[PDB]
Amino acid sequence: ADPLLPYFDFDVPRNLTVTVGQTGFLHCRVERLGDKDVSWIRKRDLHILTAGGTTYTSDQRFQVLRPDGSANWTLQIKYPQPRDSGVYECQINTEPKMSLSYTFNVVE
Amino acid sequence: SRIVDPKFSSPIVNMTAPVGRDAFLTCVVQDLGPYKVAWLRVDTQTILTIQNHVITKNQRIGIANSEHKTWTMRIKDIKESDKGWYMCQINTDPMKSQMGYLDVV
Ligand SMILES: *[C@@H]1O[C@H](CO[C@@H]2O[C@@H](C)[C@@H](O)[C@@H](O)[C@@H]2O)[C@@H](O[C@@H]2O[C@H](CO)[C@@H](O[C@@H]3O[C@H](CO)[C@@H](O)[C@H](O)[C@@H]3O)[C@H](O)[C@H]2NC(C)=O)[C@H](O)[C@H]1NC(C)=O
Ligand SMILES: *[C@@H]1O[C@H](CO[C@@H]2O[C@@H](C)[C@@H](O)[C@@H](O)[C@@H]2O)[C@@H](O[C@@H]2O[C@H](CO)[C@@H](O)[C@H](O)[C@H]2NC(C)=O)[C@H](O)[C@H]1NC(C)=O
């Protein structure tokens, strides 16, 4: 049997360090998306950042860069501060979810 | 003040529901305005709903709202694995959150 669910591309950096103010990019590649949708969340406080093409957070520093049909769901974090350091999760809305964790560090 | 400053009207009411029955988790907000209300499963950190769209592919989950103030998430045919904490979120800056517990018997 094969459910033909989506799957991640693990060949991406998952521990990213940027200097304060330097823009950070988190690369989540999802193949065979089908009818599913990809989301970015901030694990520390369970804050939804983006869901599909739409941005949920009102923090204008967060945007998801994805061209139509592409597998790349890059989370862009402009003007990062040390407060932004922590774990960010790329999750797929399957039942149960699929998730891939990313560590983001902002250095002074 | 900001002309639109959404706030939680009341804390979420804990709910207990027997297996196979429906349960409803209600989040009450004031002055939502252009902002968005979301429901999440805390234990698994899973996005369930955003506004009137169900995000999870769990077909047992639906969302309804009354006057953009009451945001009621419904869970059909409860499984014992549904027991746990659920979060209601508003996309303000900073974001606002409150949690309620669904107990299953
Ligand atoms: C909502 O419910 C949760 C969980 O309680 C569960 O659901 C209810 C509807 C009832 O059916 C309960 O019988 C059922 O277990 C409440 O959270 C719980 O809070 C208590 C403390 O208020 C925690 O109790 C323990 O306290 C002892 C010391 O007295 C410690 O040793 C323990 O480590 C623990 O702290 C309990 O763990 C906690 N349960 C969970 C799952 O988090 C919650 O307070 C309630 N909310 C409201 C508004 O009623
Ligand atoms: C994630 O990486 C951090 C730091 O990584 C740094 O940058 C990388 C590009 C690489 O060059 C590493 O060798 C660098 O150290 C690790 O965290 C520690 O972080 C503290 C402050 O955050 C720093 O002072 C320490 O020097 C870092 N320790 C080491 C050994 O790098 C962290 O352990 C990594 N986490 C995971 C899960 O891999």
Numbering used by the authors:
A (entry chain A): 48 to 155
B (entry chain B): 38 to 142
Reported in the publication:
We have recently identified interactions between two groups of Drosophila IgSF (immunoglobulin superfamily) cell adhesion molecules with properties closely matching a neuronal chemoaffinity function: 21 Dpr proteins, named after the founding member Defective proboscis extension response, selectively bind nine proteins, now called the Dpr-interacting proteins, or DIPs. All 21 Dprs and nine DIPs are predicted to contain two and three immunoglobulin (IG) domains, respectively. Our previous work identified the first IG domains, termed IG1, as the domains mediating the Dpr–DIP interaction by the formation of a pseudo-symmetric IG1-IG1 heterocomplex using the GFCC’C’ face of the immunoglobulin fold. Therefore, Dprs and DIPs are strong candidates for a synapse specification or targeting function.
We chose complexes of Dpr1 and Dpr11, as they are reported to have neuronal phenotypes, and therefore these complex structures can be directly used to investigate the relationship between Dpr–DIP interactions and the observed phenotypes. We crystallized and solved the structures of Dpr1 IG1 with DIP-η IG1, and Dpr11 IG1 with DIP-γ IG1 +2. However, one method, the statistical coupling analysis (SCA) version 5, identified one pair of amino acids, Dpr His94 (Dpr1) and DIP Met132 (DIP-η). These two residues directly contact each other and cap the hydrophobic interior of the interface. For the Dpr1–DIP-η and Dpr6–DIP-α complexes, His-to-Ala mutation unexpectedly increased affinity despite removing a hydrogen bond and significant packing. Overall, it appears that Dpr–DIP specificity is encoded not only by relationships between pairs of Dpr and DIP residues (e.g., K144 in Dpr1 with T83 in DIP-η, Figure 3d1), but also through coupling of multiple residues, and through shape complementarity, where rotameric changes help create complementary surfaces. The main chain positions of a DIP-η bound to either another DIP-η or Dpr1 are virtually identical, and surprisingly, most side chains also preserve their rotameric states. We believe that interdomain flexibility and long low-complexity ‘stalk’ regions linking the IG domains to the membrane would enable cis dimerization for homodimeric DIPs, such as DIP-α and DIP-η.
